[PDB]
Amino acid sequence: RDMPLDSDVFRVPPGYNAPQQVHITQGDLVGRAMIISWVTMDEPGSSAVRYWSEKNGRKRIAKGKMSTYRFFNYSSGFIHHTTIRKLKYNTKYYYEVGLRNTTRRFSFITPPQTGLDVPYTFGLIGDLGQSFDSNTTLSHYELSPKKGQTVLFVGDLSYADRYPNHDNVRWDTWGRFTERSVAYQPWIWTAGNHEIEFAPEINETEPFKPFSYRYHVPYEASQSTSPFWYSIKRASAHIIVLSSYSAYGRGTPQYTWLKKELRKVKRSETPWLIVLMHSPLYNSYNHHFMEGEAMRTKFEAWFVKYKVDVVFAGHVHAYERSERVSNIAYKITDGLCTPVKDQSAPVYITIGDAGNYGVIDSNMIQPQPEYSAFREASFGHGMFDIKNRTHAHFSWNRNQDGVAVEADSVWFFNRHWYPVDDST
Amino acid sequence: RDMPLDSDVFRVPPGYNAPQQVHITQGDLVGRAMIISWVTMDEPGSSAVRYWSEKNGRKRIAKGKMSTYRFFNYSSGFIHHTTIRKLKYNTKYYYEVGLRNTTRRFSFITPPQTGLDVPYTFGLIGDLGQSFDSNTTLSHYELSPKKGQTVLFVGDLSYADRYPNHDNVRWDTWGRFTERSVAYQPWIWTAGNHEIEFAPEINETEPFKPFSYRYHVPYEASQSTSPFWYSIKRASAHIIVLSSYSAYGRGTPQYTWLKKELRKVKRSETPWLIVLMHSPLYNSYNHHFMEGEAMRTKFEAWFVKYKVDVVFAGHVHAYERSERVSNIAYKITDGLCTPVKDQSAPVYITIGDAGNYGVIDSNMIQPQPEYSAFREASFGHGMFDIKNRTHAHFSWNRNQDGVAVEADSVWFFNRHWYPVDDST
Numbered sequence: 001r002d003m004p005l006d007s008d009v010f011r012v013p014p015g016y017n018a019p020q021q022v023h024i025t026q027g028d029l030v031g032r033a034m035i036i037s038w039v040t041m042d043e044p045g046s047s048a049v050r051y052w053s054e055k056n057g058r059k060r061i062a063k064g065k066m067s068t069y070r071f072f073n074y075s076s077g078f079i080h081h082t083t084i085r086k087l088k089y090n091t092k093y094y095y096e097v098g099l100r101n102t103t104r105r106f107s108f109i110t111p112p113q114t115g116l117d118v119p120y121t122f123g124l125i126g127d128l129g130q131s132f133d134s135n136t137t138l139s140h141y142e143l144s145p146k147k148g149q150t151v152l153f154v155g156d157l158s159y160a161d162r163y164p165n166h167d168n169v170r171w172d173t174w175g176r177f178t179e180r181s182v183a184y185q186p187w188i189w190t191a192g193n194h195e196i197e198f199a200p201e202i203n204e205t206e207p208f209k210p211f212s213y214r215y216h217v218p219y220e221a222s223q224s225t226s227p228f229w230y231s232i233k234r235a236s237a238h239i240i241v242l243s244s245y246s247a248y249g250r251g252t253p254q255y256t257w258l259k260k261e262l263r264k265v266k267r268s269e270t271p272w273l274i275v276l277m278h279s280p281l282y283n284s285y286n287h288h289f290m291e292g293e294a295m296r297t298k299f300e301a302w303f304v305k306y307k308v309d310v311v312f313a314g315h316v317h318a319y320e321r322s323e324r325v326s327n328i329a330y331k332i333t334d335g336l337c338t339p340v341k342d343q344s345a346p347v348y349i350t351i352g353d354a355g356n357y358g359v360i361d362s363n364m365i366q367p368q369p370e371y372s373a374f375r376e377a378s379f380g381h382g383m384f385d386i387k388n389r390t391h392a393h394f395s396w397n398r399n400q401d402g403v404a405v406e407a408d409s410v411w412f413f414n415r416h417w418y419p420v421d422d423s424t
Numbered sequence: 425r426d427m428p429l430d431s432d433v434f435r436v437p438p439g440y441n442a443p444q445q446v447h448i449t450q451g452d453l454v455g456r457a458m459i460i461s462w463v464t465m466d467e468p469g470s471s472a473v474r475y476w477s478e479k480n481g482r483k484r485i486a487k488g489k490m491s492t493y494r495f496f497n498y499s500s501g502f503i504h505h506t507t508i509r510k511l512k513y514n515t516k517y518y519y520e521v522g523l524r525n526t527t528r529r530f531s532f533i534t535p536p537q538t539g540l541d542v543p544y545t546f547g548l549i550g551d552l553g554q555s556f557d558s559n560t561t562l563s564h565y566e567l568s569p570k571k572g573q574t575v576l577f578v579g580d581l582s583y584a585d586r587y588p589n590h591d592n593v594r595w596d597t598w599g600r601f602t603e604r605s606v607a608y609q610p611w612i613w614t615a616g617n618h619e620i621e622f623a624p625e626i627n628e629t630e631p632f633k634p635f636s637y638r639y640h641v642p643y644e645a646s647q648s649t650s651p652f653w654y655s656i657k658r659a660s661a662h663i664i665v666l667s668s669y670s671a672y673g674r675g676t677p678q679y680t681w682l683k684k685e686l687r688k689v690k691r692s693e694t695p696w697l698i699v700l701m702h703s704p705l706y707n708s709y710n711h712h713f714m715e716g717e718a719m720r721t722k723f724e725a726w727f728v729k730y731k732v733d734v735v736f737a738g739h740v741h742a743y744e745r746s747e748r749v750s751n752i753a754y755k756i757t758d759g760l761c762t763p764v765k766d767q768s769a770p771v772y773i774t775i776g777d778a779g780n781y782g783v784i785d786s787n788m789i790q791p792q793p794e795y796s797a798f799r800e801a802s803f804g805h806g807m808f809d810i811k812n813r814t815h816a817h818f819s820w821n822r823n824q825d826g827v828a829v830e831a832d833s834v835w836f837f838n839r840h841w842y843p844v845d846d847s848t
C-alpha cells in the first residue's frame with residue numbers, strides 16, 4: 001500500500017539544483033533557533049539560508065554545512081544543515097534556500113517565550129511511512145481545525161528499510177512527501193527501530209546512519225552527547241526524547257543524561273512535562289506485547305517520581321490510552337507485580353497508527369486489562385492542546401472520521417498544578 | 425586499600441623499551457590462534473612476535489599493529505596487538521616479544537581440539553581491581569591445586585576510573601600486576617561498568633575507550649560487529665560473552681547477534697554452554713539489587729529455551745549461587761511473577777568478589793529467598809572444572825581459607841546430556 005514513485009506527492013520541485021526535501025526543527029533549548037535542512041541533487045550548491053522577519057524586513061544570511069553518505073550501492077545527494085540563531089519569539093519569518101540557482105521560500109513562526117500559562121498545540125504523529133494511509137493522516141492533520149503548531153514524531157519515519165538494500169530512494173521520496181508540513185512547522189524527532197538499519201549482509205553496520213545524516217537535532221543544547229536522546233523546551237512544555245534502541249543500562253550515557261535532566265526540569269517554568277519514546281511501556285495489543293518491559297524497569301519510577309504528565313509512544317500500529325498507572329513495587333519475591341492506579345504516574349498514550357506501509361495492529365489482549373482506558377485499531381493522528389498551566393486537552397482523530405471528529409478526547413489535569421483525578 | 429604505586433607487583437621490567445603489560449587471549453573461534461598484546465614505553469618498537477613450538481622448534485614471526493590513545497592529560501605508551509594463527513592444538517609454544525631492543529619470552533599451551541568429552545578447567549575471576557585483596561585472589565588462583573587453564577573474566581578490570589581524571593596510569597599498573605597470569609594463559613574479557621568511563625567533564629565521552637585500546641577480542645570470529653559481545657569455543661565449552669552496558673533492545677546489534685548465535689550452538693560438539701555478563705540477572709544482595717532486571721526481561725527465556733548451563737556474573741562484590749530457576753511467565757496482569765524451580769534454567773552464579781578496591785558487599789536481602797542456593801560475602805575466585813560431557817564441578821575458594829579449601833562445591837549435570845536434578 002506504499003504510494004508509487006510517481007505519486008504527485010513525490011514530485012521533485014522544478015529548477016536546476018532546486019532544494020528538495022526541505023525540513024525544519026528546533027535548533028536550541030528554548031525556541032529561538034531553527035535548524036533548516038534540505039537536499040540539492042544536481043550539484044553541491046550553497047548552504048546559506050536567507051531569512052528575515054515579516055516586520056523588520058532586514059534580510060540576513062546564515063551559513064550551514066553540507067554532507068553526503070553512501071548506503072550500499074546508494075549515494076546521497078548533497079545534504080545541507082544550517083542553523084539560524086537568535087530569533088525573536090512569536091514572529092513569522094521567511095527563509096529562502098537554494099540561493100545559487102533555484103531559490104525556494106518558506107516561513108515559520110517562532111514560538112512564545114517559555115511560560116507557565118503559554119498555550120500551544122502539538123500534533124502527534126508516529127509511525128508515518130509512505131502508504132496512501134499516511135497521506136491521509138498527514139492531510140487530516142493539516143486540516144485539524146485546532147491547527148497544530150509543532151509535530152511530536154514518535155519514530156519510524158519512512159520504512160525504507162522494508163525495501164531491498166533499504167533502497168534509500170524511499171528516504172528521498174518520504175522527505176519530499178512530508179515537506180509540505182515540515183518545511184513550515186518543526187517536527188521533533190524520535191528514533192524508532194525502522195531507523196536503526198543494521199544491515200550486516202550489505203555491510204552497512206553503523207546504526208541510524210541514513211536517519212542521522214538526514215535528520216539533525218539540537219542535542220547539544222540539553223547537554224546530551226548523542227542525537228538519540230535530548231530535550232527541548234517550547235512554550236509551556238518541557239519535552240524529553242528517549243531512544244528505545246540505544247542503551248539505558250545503569251551508568252550508560254543515556255541513563256546518566258536522563259537522570260540529570262529530570263532534575264533540571266522546572267515546573268514553575270514549564271508546567272507540562274512530556275516524554276517521547278518509540279517502544280511503549282504500557283501496551284495491551286499482541287504485536288510488540290511487553291517489549292517496553294526492559295526500559296520500563298529502568299525509567300518508570302523516575303517518571304512517577306517526577307510526575308511526568310504524558311508519555312507518547314508509537315511502534316504498535318494502533319491507538320491506546322491508559323489510566324494513570326504505576327507498577328513500581330515489585331521485588332521479585334513479594335508478588336507485587338500488578339499495575340495499580342497511581343495519580344502521580346503519567347498517562348501512557350500510543351499513536352503509532354499514522355499509516356506505516358498500510359497495516360494496522362488489530363489483535364488485542366482479550367480482555368482489555370484494567371490499566372488500559374481506551375484502545376482502538378484505526379489509523380489517525382493526535383493533538384495535545386495546552387490551554388493553561390492546569391489544563392491540556394488531548395484528542396485522537398480517526399482517519400475514517402471527518403477532519404473535525406474527535407473519536408477520543410480527554411482533559412489532562414497537570415500532575416504538578418492541578419493533580420486531580422483526570423482518569424475516566 | 426589499593427596497592428601503592430611502588431608495590432613490587434607494579435615494577436617495570438628492566439631494559440630499554442622492554443615489553444610490559446603482556447597479555448594474551450583466544451584469537452579465533454576454536455582455539456588455534458592467540459592475540460598477543462603488550463606495551464612499550466620508550467619508543468614504538470616492533471609489533472612482531474617470534475614464536476615456535478616446543479617440539480618443532482621452527483621459529484616463526486607474526487606481525488601485528490601498534491596504537492596509542494590520549495585520555496585527558498594522559499598519553500598511552502605504544503600498544504601492540506599481534507595475532508598468531510594456525511597453531512597446533514594442545515601444544516606448548518614459546519613467544520618472544522620486544523625483538524628490537526629488550527626481548528622477553530613467554531609460553532602458552534593451545535587447548536585440545538573442541539570435543540564432546542574434552543575436559544578443561546576454567547578459572548572464574550570477576551571484579552579484580554588492584555587492592556591487596558586482589559593480589560591475594562590472584563595468588564590463590566595461581567596456587568589452585570586443580571590448576572586453571574583460562575580465566576573467564578567477568579568485568580571491572582582495574583578501577584582506574586575511581587582515580588581522578590581516571591588516572592590511566594592505574595590501567596598501566598593493573599596491566600603489569602596481572603601479567604604474571606595473562607602473559608601465560610588467556611583471559612576471556614567481559615566489559616563492566618568500570619570500563620565504560622563516560623567522563624563528559626573531562627571531555628572523554630567515547631564509552632569503553634581505554635579498555636578497548638588495551639584489551640582486544642576475536643569478536644569478528646563469531647560474526648559480531650562489536651568487541652563487546654562475542655563468543656569462542658574452547659575444549660568442550662561454548663562461551664558467549666554479553667555487554668550489560670551496551671544495548672539489547674529488540675533489533676539492536678547485540679540483540680540480533682545473540683539470537684542467531686544461540687542457534688549456532690551445537691551441543692553434540694560443545695556440550696557445555698556458558699554465558700558471561702557483568703550485571704547479574706539473579707542477585708539477593710542489597711547492592712545493585714534488581715539492576716539485571718532489564719536484561720533479564722530480554723534474555724532469560726532464550727537461556728531457558730537453549731538450556732544454557734551456567735551464567736557467571738560479577739558486579740556484586742560477594743558470592744552467590746542459585747537454584748536452576750526461571751521466572752518467565754509474567755504477563756503483567758496474570759500475577760505469575762515469582763521464580764519457580766526450572767530444570768532447564770541455568771544456575772546463575774556471581775563471583776564479583778575478587779577484590780576490587782578492597783571492599784565487600786555484605787548487606788543481603790534478609791531472608792535468603794528461595795531461588796538463592798548459597799551466598800557469602802567473602803573475597804575469592806571460582807573454578808569450573810569440566811570433566812565429562814555430563815559432569816563439570818564448580819568450586820569457590822575463599823581468600824581466608826587455604827589454597828585448597830573449597831568453601832563451596834557443586835557438581836553440574838549437563839542440561840543437555842544428563843539433565844538430572846543437580847540442585848541442592
Ligand SMILES: *[C@@H]1O[C@H](CO)[C@@H](O)[C@H](O)[C@H]1NC(C)=O
Pocket residue numbers: 073074165
Ligand atoms: C542496487 O543493486 C540492485 C541489485 O543488487 C539493483 O537492481 C539496483 O538497481 C541497484 N541500484 C543502484 C543505484 O545501483
Ligand SMILES: *[C@@H]1O[C@H](CO)[C@@H](O)[C@H](O)[C@H]1NC(C)=O
Pocket residue numbers: 016100101
Ligand atoms: C547556476 O548558478 C551559477 C551562478 O549563479 C550560474 O553561472 C550557472 O550557469 C547557473 N545554472 C546552472 C545550470 O548551473
Ligand SMILES: *[C@@H]1O[C@H](CO)[C@@H](O)[C@H](O)[C@H]1NC(C)=O
Pocket residue numbers: 003007008009132135136139
Ligand atoms: C495526497 O493528499 C493530497 C491532499 O491532502 C492530494 O492532493 C494528493 O493527490 C494525495 N496523493 C495521494 C497519492 O494520495
Ligand SMILES: *[C@@H]1O[C@H](CO)[C@@H](O)[C@H](O)[C@H]1NC(C)=O
Pocket residue numbers: 200201202203
Ligand atoms: C560484505 O558482504 C558480506 C556480509 O557481511 C561478507 O561476506 C563480506 O566480508 C562483507 N564485507 C566486505 C568488506 O566485503
Ligand SMILES: *[C@@H]1O[C@H](CO)[C@@H](O)[C@H](O)[C@H]1NC(C)=O
Pocket residue numbers: 387388390391
Ligand atoms: C484552563 O482552561 C479551562 C478550559 O479551557 C478553563 O475552564 C479553566 O478555567 C482554565 N483555567 C484557568 C486558571 O484559567
Ligand SMILES: *[C@@H]1O[C@H](CO)[C@@H](O)[C@H](O)[C@H]1NC(C)=O
Pocket residue numbers: 497498589
Ligand atoms: C593531570 O592534571 C592533574 C590536575 O588536573 C595533575 O595534578 C596531574 O599531575 C596531571 N597529569 C599529567 C600527566 O599532566
Ligand SMILES: *[C@@H]1O[C@H](CO)[C@@H](O)[C@H](O)[C@H]1NC(C)=O
Pocket residue numbers: 440524525
Ligand atoms: C635499540 O635497538 C637498535 C637496533 O637494534 C639499536 O641501534 C639501538 O642503539 C638500541 N638501543 C637503544 C637504547 O635504542
Ligand SMILES: *[C@@H]1O[C@H](CO)[C@@H](O)[C@H](O)[C@H]1NC(C)=O
Pocket residue numbers: 427431432433556559560563
Ligand atoms: C603479591 O603476592 C605475591 C605472591 O603471590 C607476593 O610475592 C607479593 O609481594 C605480593 N605483593 C603485594 C603488594 O601484596
Ligand SMILES: *[C@@H]1O[C@H](CO)[C@@H](O)[C@H](O)[C@H]1NC(C)=O
Pocket residue numbers: 624625626627
Ligand atoms: C570540556 O570541558 C567541559 C565539559 O564538557 C566543557 O565546558 C567544554 O566545552 C568541554 N569541551 C571542550 C571542547 O572544551
Ligand SMILES: *[C@@H]1O[C@H](CO)[C@@H](O)[C@H](O)[C@H]1NC(C)=O
Pocket residue numbers: 811812814815
Ligand atoms: C564423569 O565424571 C564423573 C566424576 O569425575 C564420573 O563419576 C562419571 O562416571 C563420568 N562419566 C563418564 C561418562 O565417564
Ligand SMILES: [Fe+3]
Pocket residue numbers: 127156315316352356
Ligand atoms: Fe512502526
Ligand SMILES: [Fe+3]
Pocket residue numbers: 551580739740776780
Ligand atoms: Fe565492581
Ligand SMILES: [Zn+2]
Pocket residue numbers: 156192193194278314315316
Ligand atoms: Zn517500530
Ligand SMILES: [Zn+2]
Pocket residue numbers: 580616617618702738739740
Ligand atoms: Zn560493576
